[PDB]
Symmetry: D2
Subunit: 476 residues, 4 copies
């Protein structure tokens, strides 16, 4: 393996900056490469190119824009192993899961291309509202918003770059992608696929750099017409106060509850809970982060979950381990603190805590109470609390007391009751007898409270990054 | 007893001959309705086609206003109309008033659904780059003249459910109620006339089937036929309509599939309410219970108990089981009951008939060689057919030529949804009786149960077409 | 000399007897297609109904992958298929290859449109407060077996435009191409077979109308009939379908209304391209010019100049005007020309006929007592009818039994839209010739021009039904 | 006639310790007072609203619609009573003020019926991946929660009801904050909702001084959505305080009327004058600059000039076309734009006159884009005519504005007019008609600094709802 010096895509050209940021693999410390450390003047060059490209891009037919997206997705499928191998090292994601992330990104790009090209407008009748305006009709068609700034997260630096880029591009918007620093190589590899597909100069560009130099600058810039961001809740809250009146989409944290009723299939509930809670070592916003279980089935459910947590593989990304090293030392320190607080307050550790560097073994706690930090705080690590409840009303109350409202799971055999519970839960999506998940990517993805703003899922993302233009006239 | 008249071009008209209508439960003379000739039908259709141009060019809000006024009049006169409706079709007095109230609800809902219908704007650039400046402006238009044919069992509700969706969209209408039910249809017509519906926009036709039955459907003036009635009549209409669009609500033999894990008391409650409502003279009634062997004995006893509590008597006393529409209908039902007894079915409640008042009959051990397992009785008789597997319940359910609705009683909803996908029916109700309601929901039948989708927005969509205006932006 | 075979249940089969097919322009023997019996049609339908369960239970993604593969094969073989299609229906070589490429585009578009199939969730509380916890989950389902009947004039495009929308939605299909056009239909079928379409999901039928014509439509296995052809055959199909859903694209007599303020050069260009494309053998062709008298002499002169430049000759030479499909078609067009001449119409270009190759005929001073003012010729003849007012143009346009499309040539768009509202047609094109495209736009007729709405999403909607599952939230 | 008005808070009418006296801008007449709420009183309004939300969101749509219909019937009944006071409060013509109340009732009724039949969707997992073919998503609408509606002085009843009714039908609870000049009208609208029997806490009002509760009402954690109409500077401040919460902003405009050589100049002049000078130009949606092709400019300017010379200038009680502006600062700002245009050499076709805050209508010709009047929203009766020689120049000048609410195009070539409309950076283009918000079922939106979000009845309902997805696997 030889570390490479990567370049940003700026107005159809690949550009270095005077300074750069060296990226290391979180699992091994191996140097992977460097990405440019852009200056504010270089961000200005990116946005000037994007605004100059907008007129010719938005005036192309939908089929012409869709052709570029399909070509980019075919190139990603062609290079999925080459890109997935680097994505795996960059964010300590299992090799197979990293290659699957690249394939999922090609699927979302293809799906957005076809969803976006068949968007329709509407014709409204004046006579629906008043008799005197019966000959007046409004011809309402969709239009792009302009320049979209897409900011991807470290945990899905390609998938949640494509989930923003393709819906924005099909609608006729121009895009600047700002990947996270830990994930910027993978983001620039995605950019190479769009460049090789022949995306016109300035239509798609990348920005890489340090938060202290360009962090607020890329968002506050008046060239930006829309900010689409996935990342931490505190950073998300900052973007909301910098966007001003400009539309935004935020995908932030979660503390998804899994409510287990007395009539649940406990073995199946345990399977779905462990798959959801410990995927990518719990470093997912949509992940079962707390089990709210009825007292009478709690001992048997905990035994079923424990059996499965003990069998999860813990190790290196190259080995496709279920639990891989966390993204950085600060993240593992934070998770260890939550583990220590639950232990010191009397929670039962059903599986042992171990920390090898930043590789934390999966910890399952029973008898977790609302005074413990782990009942509320999003860990972004492999630790799952089980909180016992006496009534369904109590589970709803504890679930809704969270500042997060991304998704919830309900495990029961009474679906009419599960729907009644789902109506009361302050979340975007409720999965019945299955783990929480963003997929399938055509379904809406949204969070209530501090989990975000806006509705994603492919068609919803296109609708968010478009506006309408109405032309009104009188028939004679 | 009154001599009723047809609404034709804003005028009330008698014909040379009349048909006297008697109450099926008492034989009380209620009045007479005109026996229209083919020439008088021609004048109804000429009047409607003449009124169509001004009617379709009104705004949606203007058409909605006439419907809201007609619905307000039906609410005002619900007791007065319901009292006559009750007698004309031997429906319980309170149920007849409820029917008029429900009709007013449907009319008001159709008026507001229809006035906000929107068109679409399509892009040529979605299909080919060279046509990126070509757009299509697609707006809805009425089909023209709608012939609405209502049934005896819901002569006001299933007249208004066709009339109001047709009218809001700009169509003109001719209502042909059944002879037994024609007074009720003409009473509904009075509310539209009092509401100020323009002359010729809404009209009525009454007469004998041997004189005008085929004539009204085959007439070139009619652009759409919307009918509710028996399957043999519907089949004839489908042939006579030719290429013209149709809505048909025909026979039903709705199955209620009861699984081993069902709440049997809840299943029995819904099955008896669904099977015996209006003495079983409903297309959406539960007409056969397909029950898994292990719970069949318990379910049969629970159903029997509730059948024994049904009141049997006169419409004026709000009996659950009233006399059937006519002698021919009760002879047919008696014949199906005799066939089942002769073939060995167990009568849990046995056959009793006084005039055309048949007591509710419940049969167990009904087999596929019995007429009652398949034929729609339109009477108060319910067969219970035992099955060994869910696959057998699906197969027997789907072997019917009918497929209006089905019910599934079980605590496993993902499994119930999987069964619902396999059933050749329009709607599947989980842990409830089969029913048309609520009236905003789609209502349709597969195979010989009909054509087209009803329910308010669906009926509006059915009785409209589109007009596309295409041009190139410069 | 090749003996073509039908695709039946995944295998290619001949029949005992065969129909030899000849190139209409040269008499060249192209090969033979099977002469299926009624029993062979039964076997095709049984194989399709058997395949339906496993096909409808596939995911939309899986059904779309087959359609995309079939479309790629059609693109790969466009020259090979186009070459035979050109000979079989005497269509210009380049235009025949273009038909194949357009079919692949429609198939790809249908696969992507149908895979995004959405349902609806309706609220009981929208209609009545007591049912606020009742919801309806409404999902789309295939109708079952679709019989697609393609026309000779678009034997691949109007086979693929029916087949792909039906297949993506989970329907199984039987394609019956016209006898003159069956080799092209079976060549299209090869692409679906090589794509690996499961056995029985897609099948073909070929045979004589006297043996299987009515039989294929009356058969109770068929759940939907999607046909393109002439009005008299379509009228027969509506009756034989009974209550089953249909899509019919029949005759057209599209008017081109030219007002005093029209851009006459643009009107002439569009009128000539639309009227004489494929020798006028198109349902959507401009078939009558209704022009305001003050601009008629100049409009007729500019049309005449462009008509005289059309090439007249053989399909292999990409001539604009090629020989008509058969002798009967050319005799029918000749009779219309003679009637117009005998009634005083002015021949701006002269009639000539060599075999079934009729030179393009333009008539002026055509009146409403001439057959050519009303009857669909399906040949290279265009009448110009002078009018004194826009009201007269609308009246004459609407007096036609046909109503597929119309064109309006004027610089006053708001007035053109007001005229479009009054025309009894499916689509009105402003300042352009009538056309079906783009294939995402709706395509439909009024009066005797058809039944149902075509255009990709509309065709998918027509060949699906809904299944509503209703339950109460607790 | 001056009354002590009260806020509607949790079904009761409350005064505060301090009050704000409201005077008629045209005459100085004392109209009454409105409470000067404290931050703790705002907290009580929001606590009441969140408490009422649970039982309101779980009602059926038909039950919520019945309250809106009853409230609209009450507004029609009291249209003269409310309009008489609204006219004095914001110096709007008496008949125009009554018409505003009637229009509000129309919007409320249309919102009740539009909202009650909104639907959910069912999505197939098999549309995206074969392995999830038995997974389906049942997606239903849900309210966003508590909506803070902030109405503007120029439409204090119409653009209060335009936010309240769409929010309520969807199951949201509402707090209306009228502008201080327009708070009596806002509280009169609240009386109709209260008499209609709207449950306690479902609909509430807030009145007070900007220096006591201005930022507080927006920054409050209880508020889940802010729906505002008003000035661009205030709207931009709301964007800073909303954080992650969804907003709708209806801000300023500088609508262009593009007049081509083939236009019907009499039709263009009539529409331009009706739109520009309605309510003395104090409307965001109003023709605020004429971009005319030079060949027809002398004729168009003469036709506009004759119509402007006929507009009545006077008091709201006399239904004058031009009434006194809302306040002295507003009139001073308008006079400044007029003076800049005069000093830079524009031709004053109609004479400038100012008596108190009543400015006579001023029409300028030969306005060049170095003049402030070419760009700045006056909110007063002044209109510039800017001559251009090409359509491309008219499009460039039109789009150079920071505003993008609406535009008008006057021409007989509609295919060309549609091609121009595609290039204009606005929410709506009206062909051969003045810009206007109506009909209220149509979308109403502005690009650039004119706003955020899409209004019009169905659009406002969609904006103030979210979705709840329930995903399960068929077996």
């Amino acid at each position: 393996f030889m570390a490479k010096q990567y370049k940003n895509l700026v107005n159809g050209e690949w550009k270095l900056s005077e300074n750069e940021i060296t990226i290391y693999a979180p699992a091994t410390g191996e140097e992977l490469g460097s990405v440019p450390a852009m200056t504010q003047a270089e961000v200005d060059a990116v946005y000037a190119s994007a605004k100059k490209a907008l007129s010719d891009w938005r005036t192309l037919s939908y089929v012409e824009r869709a052709a570029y997206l399909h070509k980019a997705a075919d190139i990603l499928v062609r290079d999925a192993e080459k890109i997935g191998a680097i994505l795996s090292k960059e964010v300590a994601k299992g090799h197979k899961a990293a290659v699957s992330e690249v394939i999922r990104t090609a699927e979302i790009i293809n799906y957005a291309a076809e969803e976006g090209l068949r968007m329709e407008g509407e014709v409204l009748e004046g006579g629906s509202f008043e008799a005197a305006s019966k000959k007046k009709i409004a011809i309402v068609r969709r239009e792009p918003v302009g320049l979209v700034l897409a900011i991807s997260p470290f945990n899905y630096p390609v998938n949640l770059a494509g989930s923003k880029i393709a819906p924005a591009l099909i609608a006729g918007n121009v895009v600047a992608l700002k990947p996270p620093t830990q994930g910027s190589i993978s983001g620039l590899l995605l950019a190479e696929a769009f460049a090789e597909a022949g995306i016109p100069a300035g239509v798609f560009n990348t920005i890489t750099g340090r938060g202290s130099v360009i962090g607020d600058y890329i968002v506050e810039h008046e060239a930006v017409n829309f900010i689409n961001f996935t990342g931490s809740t505190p950073i998300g809250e900052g973007i909301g106060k910098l966007a001003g009146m400009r539309p935004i989409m935020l995908e932030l944290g979660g503390k998804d509850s899994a409510i287990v009723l007395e009539d649940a299939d406990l073995a199946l509930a345990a399977k779905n809970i462990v798959a959801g809670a410990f995927g990518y070592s719990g470093q997912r916003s949509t992940a079962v982060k707390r089990v709210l279980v009825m007292d009478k089935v709690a001992d048997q459910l905990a035994a079923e979950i424990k059996t499965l947590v003990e069998k999860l593989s813990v190790g290196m990304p190259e080995d496709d381990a279920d639990i891989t090293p966390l993204i950085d030392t600060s993240a593992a320190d934070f998770v260890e603190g939550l583990i220590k607080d639950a232990t010191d307050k009397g929670a039962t550790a059903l599986t042992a805590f171990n920390r090898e560097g930043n590789l934390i073994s999966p910890v399952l706690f029973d008898h977790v109470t609302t005074d413990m930090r782990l009942a509320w705080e999003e860990p972004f690590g492999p630790v799952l609390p089980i909180i016992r409840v006496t009534t369904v009303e109590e589970a709803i109350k504890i679930s809704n007391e969270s500042e997060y409202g991304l998704q919830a799971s309900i495990f029961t055999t009474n679906f009419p009751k599960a729907f009644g519970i789902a109506e009361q839960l302050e979340v975007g999506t409720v999965h019945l007898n299955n783990k929480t998940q963003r997929g399938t990517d055509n379904f809406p993805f949204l969070g209530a409270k501090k989990s975000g703003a806006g509705v994603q899922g492919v068609k919803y993302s296109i609708e968010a990054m478009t506006t309408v233009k109405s032309v009104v006239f009188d028939i004679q």
